[PDB]
Amino acid sequence: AWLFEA
Amino acid sequence: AWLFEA
Amino acid sequence: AWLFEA
Amino acid sequence: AWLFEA
Amino acid sequence: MKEIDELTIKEYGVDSRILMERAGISVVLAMEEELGNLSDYRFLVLCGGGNNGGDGFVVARNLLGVVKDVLVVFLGKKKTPDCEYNYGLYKKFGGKVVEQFEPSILNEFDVVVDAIFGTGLRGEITGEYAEIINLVNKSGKVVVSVDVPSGIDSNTGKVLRTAVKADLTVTFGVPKIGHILFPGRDLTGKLKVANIGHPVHLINSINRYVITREMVRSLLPERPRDSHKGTYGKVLIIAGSRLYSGAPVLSGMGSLKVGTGLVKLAVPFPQNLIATSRFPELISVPIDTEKGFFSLQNLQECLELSKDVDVVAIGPGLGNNEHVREFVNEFLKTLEKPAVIDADAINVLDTSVLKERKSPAVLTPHPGEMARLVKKTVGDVKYNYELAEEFAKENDCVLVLKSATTIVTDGEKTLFNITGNTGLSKGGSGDVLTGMIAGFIAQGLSPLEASTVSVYLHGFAAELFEQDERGLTASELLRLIPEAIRRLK
Amino acid sequence: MKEIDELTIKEYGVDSRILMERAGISVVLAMEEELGNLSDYRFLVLCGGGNNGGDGFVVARNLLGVVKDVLVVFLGKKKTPDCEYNYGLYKKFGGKVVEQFEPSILNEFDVVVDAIFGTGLRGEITGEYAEIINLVNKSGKVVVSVDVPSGIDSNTGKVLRTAVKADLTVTFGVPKIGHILFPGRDLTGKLKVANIGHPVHLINSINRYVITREMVRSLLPERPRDSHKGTYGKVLIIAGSRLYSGAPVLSGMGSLKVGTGLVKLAVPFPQNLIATSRFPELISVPIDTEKGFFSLQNLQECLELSKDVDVVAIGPGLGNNEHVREFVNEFLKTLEKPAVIDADAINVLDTSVLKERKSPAVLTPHPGEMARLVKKTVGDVKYNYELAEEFAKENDCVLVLKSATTIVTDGEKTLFNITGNTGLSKGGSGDVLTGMIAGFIAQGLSPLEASTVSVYLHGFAAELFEQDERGLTASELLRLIPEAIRRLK
Amino acid sequence: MKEIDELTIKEYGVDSRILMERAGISVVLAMEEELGNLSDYRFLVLCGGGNNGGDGFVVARNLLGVVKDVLVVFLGKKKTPDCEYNYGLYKKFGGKVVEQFEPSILNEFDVVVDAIFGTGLRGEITGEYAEIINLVNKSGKVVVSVDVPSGIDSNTGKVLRTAVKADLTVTFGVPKIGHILFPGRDLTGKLKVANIGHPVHLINSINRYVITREMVRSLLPERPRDSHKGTYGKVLIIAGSRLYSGAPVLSGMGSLKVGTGLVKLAVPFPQNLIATSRFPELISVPIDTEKGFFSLQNLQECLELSKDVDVVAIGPGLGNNEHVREFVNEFLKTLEKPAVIDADAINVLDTSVLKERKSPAVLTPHPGEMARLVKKTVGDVKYNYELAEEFAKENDCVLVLKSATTIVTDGEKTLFNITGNTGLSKGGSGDVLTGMIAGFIAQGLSPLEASTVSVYLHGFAAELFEQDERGLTASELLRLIPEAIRRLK
Numbered sequence A, B, C, D: 001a002w003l004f005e006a
Numbered sequence E, F, G: 001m002k003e004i005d006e007l008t009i010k011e012y013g014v015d016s017r018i019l020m021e022r023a024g025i026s027v028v029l030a031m032e033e034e035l036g037n038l039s040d041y042r043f044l045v046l047c048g049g050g051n052n053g054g055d056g057f058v059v060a061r062n063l064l065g066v067v068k069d070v071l072v073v074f075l076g077k078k079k080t081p082d083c084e085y086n087y088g089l090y091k092k093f094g095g096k097v098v099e100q101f102e103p104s105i106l107n108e109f110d111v112v113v114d115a116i117f118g119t120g121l122r123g124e125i126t127g128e129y130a131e132i133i134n135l136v137n138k139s140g141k142v143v144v145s146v147d148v149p150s151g152i153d154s155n156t157g158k159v160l161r162t163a164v165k166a167d168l169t170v171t172f173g174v175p176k177i178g179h180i181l182f183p184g185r186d187l188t189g190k191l192k193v194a195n196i197g198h199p200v201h202l203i204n205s206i207n208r209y210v211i212t213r214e215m216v217r218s219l220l221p222e223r224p225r226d227s228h229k230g231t232y233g234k235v236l237i238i239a240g241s242r243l244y245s246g247a248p249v250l251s252g253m254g255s256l257k258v259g260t261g262l263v264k265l266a267v268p269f270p271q272n273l274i275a276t277s278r279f280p281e282l283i284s285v286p287i288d289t290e291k292g293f294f295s296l297q298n299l300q301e302c303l304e305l306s307k308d309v310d311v312v313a314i315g316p317g318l319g320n321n322e323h324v325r326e327f328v329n330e331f332l333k334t335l336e337k338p339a340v341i342d343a344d345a346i347n348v349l350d351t352s353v354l355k356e357r358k359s360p361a362v363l364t365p366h367p368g369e370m371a372r373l374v375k376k377t378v379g380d381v382k383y384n385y386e387l388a389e390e391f392a393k394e395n396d397c398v399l400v401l402k403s404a405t406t407i408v409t410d411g412e413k414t415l416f417n418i419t420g421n422t423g424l425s426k427g428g429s430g431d432v433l434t435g436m437i438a439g440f441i442a443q444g445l446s447p448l449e450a451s452t453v454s455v456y457l458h459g460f461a462a463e464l465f466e467q468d469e470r471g472l473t474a475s476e477l478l479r480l481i482p483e484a485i486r487r488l489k
């Protein structure tokens, strides 16, 4: 979750 | 596949 | 068995 | 592998 | 295929004996794949005097030393050069031939290889030929037919007095029409098509094909994500009467289940209300009729409704009286949209109307309707693909002649469908197929492509029914269509 | 987002090079997550002269020494400071750049990283830019686009002459409108949104959002155990005609399946009986009409029926003639309840009526209906969120502009829905959505919240269909709604 | 690594702030991988005034808005430029710093990020620094150390008065010696090595490595199918005495289990019979001795036995008296084969003999034996890799200094082994390792390669013991070696 949102 | 088709 | 032996 | 080695 | 053999030998230069060797070994490999290890079986090889028999001698010679017992019964009088050559090999290899048999000969064998007649069959089978074939058929042994079961006419599928019933048929190059049409299709049992070394270009040039899963897959239209119902076409179904209120609903849902965007029914009032009580997705326009049947008084309303659609299906449940006949023919004469013409619209059709139409048409008769349409007997038209081709060509249409094997033709190209089962032998299944074809035309497939995809998917859906096929109904068939589509890809 | 970058640099003090480094590494991590171990792939990095290209140089430099091969094709003329700086690093690290390419260059590479143009795209792509993009698109290689696929306008989703088709797009901070609207949404492939170090407060301040599962989850109303049907509201649906008897049933069940307590239909007699024959849970009030369509003669009965409900939906299947127009407009002028206005009620709507209504409204046009409503072309209104916002603001309503990506706006806040598939591209699906919105308003959600939850759930239900999407029908969609709701929590 | 940072900044041109940003984010990603979703944890970030602290400020800033709570305790006086810059960012982002703490501050936090001291640690930790570190260590919170746990000297692994005990340490570029040697290795907890953007060429140039599975895998010799025992070498083991009859058996099987073709023991009679009663595969030559110990009277027989082998191992269980000393030194002076010198052969070794040998040698002391060999204390030699390197270089040998982390060096190249567990802390395990090294030399590996593969495999075999490690014995260790080998490939 910290780096990417889908 | 080379010899037979069904 | 008819065509190949291993 | 790109970011971390263990 | 006879031209294909001749060209492969005479122009490409493949020795006829090489083709025959390849034929025979392909039968051995096929049998191994079907029976497992062959070394414990005893084989009875029945050889005619032709090249079918020659194929049989290759089979027999190749089993020598490797199985428990081989015997050839040679039933011919004379032998062709390649049969004689291969008989010669069988015998140099230590093979036993006999030229007579006793009814009891089947006793000491487990597998019968049927190399009596192939594509060279001419006329009825009688005499010793018939009696050995009837003995084989009573024997309960495993039967493997070389090329075509002996006694099937390979151009028609008809039984010439008597024929072998095979568990396995191994054919060479391409399936023959007689493995595809009944009764031949039934006697063929499981069909394997062997590559025996013909140039692929020759095999691919054959003009009459079986509809396969891969063909249907590549015809299914695309579903681009940025789309809306208009992307997927609009169908009008003109159908039903006070007698036949169910047909419109089955045709309409048939169109929806194959992915059509909008489907409208025109059905006599109040029978139109039946459709939306079952499926409220459908639009079911009430048509005011004098006596519960379409007539000329509804011509103008139907042409109006037709202006806003891509295809019109007409006929299921219309009834057949003179007022329906007048309406159907004036409508089709004036309609400038593709038409799918079924059922009672076929029964009242004036075929002169088809010739003068500039727009395309698909006709979907069962043999009773085709017989009435061309003024012949059911027996003369059933499985008569050449008659279907002539009709399609002369009337500038696609003809879909329904039966256990369905023929789809535009007069140039002819396709055979072999999906389905006897659950479709029940009222309503035809009405579904009509909607399916209209639906695929609306989505942009040619009438021929639409018919090809629909007959395949319609039969495949029937096969996906979970319980006994005889209990399948049209409503259940509809529910299975989207599963058929998913399995296709 | 351009303001967001500028503020992060100029006021928060984050070096622009740090943002660019973070951008580039996030692309490497994204590719690893998608492709697995990168060490066996060969990478072709296509870099423009802008900051998109600068991001690309960071990608390339970070793959040096760790993958099988990297090559940069630099296609720009000049370089921005950060692009130049990162080009400089790539080269000090031992990187190979070339400034020309041969159609064959794609040969020796497995992955193309597309860093040609991002948000800086202006005007049509031509020349070498276009030709390399068309070569990439024909190459069948894996394509990873930096920020936005080059050639998509990131504010509209439109293709500026030609555009890259990506397998994976990695965007920074927030999704751009051009990943959300088509065709851009299609070319984006799989979208990953990377955090590159913007203050979260700036990211959260963006005024146009994608509707997510978490947002919809927190909007779903509560179901307290001590409740009864009145807890969950009452809907009146004014819908149907003698031509369109199905629409009311689909709208009514749409309200029931989202948890509404009581749903009443007003439908012309006898078409009202259709609804309860299918779903006897529905109340379907017969309206006496002269010719099968609502008219002023039914105004008083409908206002009466409206007094006892929390919301009224109007329009599906009403037909569009002058008597319907007179009825719809006088009704809405007098109705002092929230109104959900759809379909033919939109086609006959006098927008002056909307302005004078004190009660709220949601309008639910597809682009054809929106085009007719504002007297523009379908092409001018389709995906035109600024036009939707203006309309919503000027008419004091919520506008739900339906399409593969649906826009939901009240003029201030705008939400984009990306659930659904092409099974909804079929008559009836709209009628279901109308009932859903009315239903959620009845349960106490604002018109905007109701519309937000409903468009998400309506599309998600379609995705839960078990067979091929093209066979989905509205009736099946209804059955899937409660499963969509369960999956949401 | 300090030179590596300087070169990356000053010559390659990477902004020091970019390296620091990369450091900090790699800590966030590492923590996420270890703790799962970070959004529910509260973080206490302890920052010194140096660049370790600057890394810490990047960590803290990047958690802002995304986790439940962050607080920085800044414990330094002054700040380096990059620490100050990143402190500045943390604060512009809305971060809370405090410069004092109460013992109770650990109360309201779940995770402690230790960014107090990294490689810049100099001298003992005292004062507030010590007290916060002792509070952290008593707190039972999850501890994540930036680069090295604060208080470990990163060049030696020694604790400078007090040190942080971490659950997770994230280090940059390469592991430091202080994560590899104890006590530092113990305080490091789980070590992740993050790539922060150094040119790979610089990272790869580091001259002191951890022995990895991949390195050992690529060193394992080939087993070509057309081979025989001579392909795989011959070992002579000169070992044992009337006091120590077991050592020869463990060394001999150690050679056999790593794939050596023929192994011969020379052991005083009757103790030689012990070996073949246990393992009849071994050849165990009886040596006639006066009193049960090797002496000069056996010199000639041992040189004779040595002529037909590829390597000689000597020392396990020999005993240490003057006659053994005379024998061992005259033997090694005359032996012109690689020698593996262990145990009592080390205790009596005259190091002048090593210098004059033209043939190679590997010495395998534990720290007690190394201490006696160079006339220093156990404390001075334990983990003293620079002393090991000097000794190896001056005596032209490979030195294998055994301990929980084993050092393998030839004076130029130094490798650290981290496989194994405390089941090897028991008599006999050393004797096995001696045989393993001799075995691999016999199969054609260099003395350094042989030692590298053997220390890894010897420790890995111990880890494969199925029950509690403290019950592992040398005999069981032997049985596990071929499983260790299989797992390596």
Ligand SMILES: Nc1ncnc2c1ncn2[C@@H]1O[C@H](COP(=O)(O)OP(=O)(O)OC[C@H]2O[C@@H](O)[C@H](O)[C@@H]2O)[C@@H](O)[C@H]1O
Binding pocket: E316, E317, E343, E344, E365, E366, E369, E402, E403, E404, E405, E406, E419, E420, E421, E422, E423, E424, E425, E426, E427, E428, E429, E430, E431, E433, E458, E459
């Ligand atoms: N054994 C079978 N195997 C495979 N397919 C079959 C089988 N039996 C029938 N079918 C298929 O089922 C469909 C039946 O279509 P129709 O013969 O038109 O039958 P039906 O649905 O009863 O027709 C409905 C009505 O319309 C008019 O033809 C007539 O008034 C009839 O009552 C065709 O596609 C046909 O190929």
Ligand SMILES: Nc1ncnc2c1ncn2[C@@H]1O[C@H](COP(=O)(O)OP(=O)(O)OC[C@H]2O[C@@H](O)[C@H](O)[C@@H]2O)[C@@H](O)[C@H]1O
Binding pocket: E224, E225, E226, E227, E228, E229, F316, F317, F343, F344, F365, F366, F369, F402, F403, F404, F405, F406, F419, F420, F421, F422, F423, F424, F425, F426, F427, F428, F429, F430, F431, F433, F458, F459
């Ligand atoms: N490819 C797609 N992907 C996702 N969603 C889609 C897609 N295609 C359609 N949808 C959704 O399906 C719904 C279709 O709504 P309508 O366009 O109103 O279609 P429909 O149900 O056919 O309308 C019924 C009737 O009412 C009047 O508009 C008109 O008389 C029409 O016949 C919308 O929510 C739309 O976003």
Ligand SMILES: Nc1ncnc2c1ncn2[C@@H]1O[C@H](COP(=O)(O)OP(=O)(O)OC[C@H]2O[C@@H](O)[C@H](O)[C@@H]2O)[C@@H](O)[C@H]1O
Binding pocket: G316, G317, G343, G344, G365, G366, G369, G402, G403, G404, G405, G406, G419, G420, G421, G422, G423, G424, G425, G426, G427, G428, G429, G430, G431, G433, G458, G459
């Ligand atoms: N905690 C540990 N973790 C990992 N490895 C360990 C650990 N403890 C011991 N080892 C390993 O076990 C082996 C022990 O070797 P030695 O110290 O030589 O111990 P040992 O087998 O008892 O020696 C046998 C005999 O020979 C002479 O040294 C002396 O006479 C001794 O009694 C070495 O490889 C060492 O690295």
Ligand SMILES: [K+]
Binding pocket: E052, E114, E115, E116, E117, E118, E145, E146, E147, E148, E149, E150
């Ligand atoms: K035959």
Ligand SMILES: [K+]
Binding pocket: F052, F114, F115, F116, F117, F118, F145, F146, F147, F148, F149, F150
């Ligand atoms: K791009």
Ligand SMILES: [K+]
Binding pocket: G052, G114, G115, G116, G117, G118, G145, G146, G147, G148, G149, G150
């Ligand atoms: K630290």
Ligand SMILES: [Mg+2]
Binding pocket: E342, E343, E366, E430, E431
């Ligand atoms: Mg029919």
Ligand SMILES: [Mg+2]
Binding pocket: F342, F343, F366, F430, F431
């Ligand atoms: Mg609609």
Ligand SMILES: [Mg+2]
Binding pocket: G342, G343, G366, G430, G431
């Ligand atoms: Mg020892």
